[PDB]
Design a protein around this ligand. Structure first.
Ligand SMILES: Nc1ccn([C@@H]2O[C@H](COP(=O)(O)OP(=O)(O)O)[C@@H](O)[C@H]2O)c(=O)n1
Ligand SMILES: Nc1ccn([C@@H]2O[C@H](COP(=O)(O)OP(=O)(O)O)[C@@H](O)[C@H]2O)c(=O)n1
Length: 223
């Protein structure tokens, strides 16, 4: 039985999770926010050790023994729901150093594919390496982006303590690290549909991804 798979990759604050949530809702699909898994590992390390040093033996051992569950995008660490902590500024400041570690990417890889394999209708998975690593044979691979300035302005309007320039710098730095790291970097491929949504609403972006999906669905079904 065929399960549909939509991959949504893109840089920081491009709208991937909110767009993917709406796409999934309109298609009757589930939605996995893969970055919550990296954020949860980051939070676990911060809380346990204070400093995040994922190459240290003690921290690596902690991560490997950690039981991570995700249910409706709530993430549990050894049974405890840590979802309300995943967007804390301290997690933001350290999640790149966690995500660069091969052994952590391997741990999270298995978790994501277990979620994907349980889906019986379709799933939208957002992240950085969904099209290149997690769902390399996704029916539709979307690379969702906008200018750094557009994305920083969006995040700025959400409120918070950072200035616009601080957000812009943080976004550019995180994007640069995600693009240049050794393992599973953020990259568009020739099989991606690149959507620049600077001049689009959230609903327009979701409706464009749905249009693209229906076009590949009809194409694939008959060819
Ligand atoms: N066309 C759009 C798309 C998203 N947004 C907003 O931009 C913010 C970033 O969205 P997000 O958290 O889903 O983005 P990601 O970091 O998950 O890619 C949210 O507050 C969205 O509602 C917008 O203002 N205009
Ligand atoms: N599939 C993924 C998802 C997230 N990540 C890492 O986790 C960080 C946070 O991802 P996110 O999706 O929660 O964050 P935003 O896109 O909202 O900035 C990214 O900047 C990457 O370092 C990754 O490496 N691979």
């Amino acid at each position: 039985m065929k399960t549909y798979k939509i991959a949504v990759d893109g840089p920081a604050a491009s709208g991937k999770s909110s767009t993917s949530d709406l796409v999934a809702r309109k298609l009757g699909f589930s939605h996995l926010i893969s970055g919550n898994l990296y954020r949860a590992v980051t939070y676990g390390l911060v809380r346990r050790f204070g400093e995040v040093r994922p190459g240290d033996e003690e921290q690596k051992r902690f991560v490997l023994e950690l039981s991570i569950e995700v249910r409706n995008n709530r993430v549990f660490l050894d049974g405890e729901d840590v979802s309300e902590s995943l967007r804390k500024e301290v997690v933001d400041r350290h999640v790149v150093s966690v995500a660069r570690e091969k052994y952590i990417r391997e741990k999270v890889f298995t978790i994501q594919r277990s979620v994907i394999d349980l889906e019986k209708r379709g799933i939208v998975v957002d992240g950085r390496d969904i099209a290149t690593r997690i769902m390399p044979n996704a029916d539709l691979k979307v690379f969702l982006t906008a200018s750094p300035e557009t994305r920083a302005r969006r995040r700025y309007m959400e409120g918070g303590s950072e200035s616009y320039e601080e957000l812009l710098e943080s976004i550019k730095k995180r994007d640069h690290n995600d693009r240049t790291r050794e393992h599973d970097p953020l990259v568009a491929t020739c099989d991606s549909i690149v959507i620049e949504n600077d001049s689009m609403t959230l609903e327009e972006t979701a409706d464009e991804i749905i249009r693209l999906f229906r076009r590949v669905e009809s194409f694939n079904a008959g060819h």
